[PDB]
């Protein structure tokens, strides 16, 4: 398997298959599937890392969409990446304006 040859977890073969069966170019390079899968695996590791930390904070083992929402929105770059994306059952960050606070 080409995934084992690159030390990656995501299937390089399935990536190469989807790149050919999607009509993006006449030909598909050999290093592109390995390099596209590596970015995907890195980004999934980024989210799962912050999601597991949010899971530890909520004292729960299984990651729920609440954890994904908190993880993506607390990161400055993951928020910019998924800026036009709504996560199901995600909710919003706790935020109350200063003027609205009691005085």
């Amino acid at each position: 398997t080409r995934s084992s040859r690159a030390g990656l977890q995501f299937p390089v073969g399935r990536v190469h298959r989807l790149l050919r069966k999607g009509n993006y170019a006449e030909r598909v390079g050999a290093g592109a599937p390995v390099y596209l899968a590596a970015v995907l695996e890195y980004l999934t590791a980024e989210i799962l890392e912050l999601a597991g930390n949010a899971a530890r904070d909520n004292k729960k083992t299984r990651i729920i969409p609440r954890h994904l929402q908190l993880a993506v929105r607390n990161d400055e770059e993951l928020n910019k990446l998924l800026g036009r994306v709504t996560i199901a059952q995600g909710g919003v960050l706790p935020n109350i304006q200063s003027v609205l606070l009691p005085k």
């Binding site: 709504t86 199901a88 059952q89 995600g90 919003v92 304006q97 609205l100």
Partner: peptide
């Protein structure tokens, strides 16, 4: 899901 998220985001901008 998308409707409530749009409405929550709209009230955030509204507030």
């Amino acid at each position: 899901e998308a409707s409530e998220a749009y409405l929550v985001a709209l009230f955030e901008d509204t507030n």
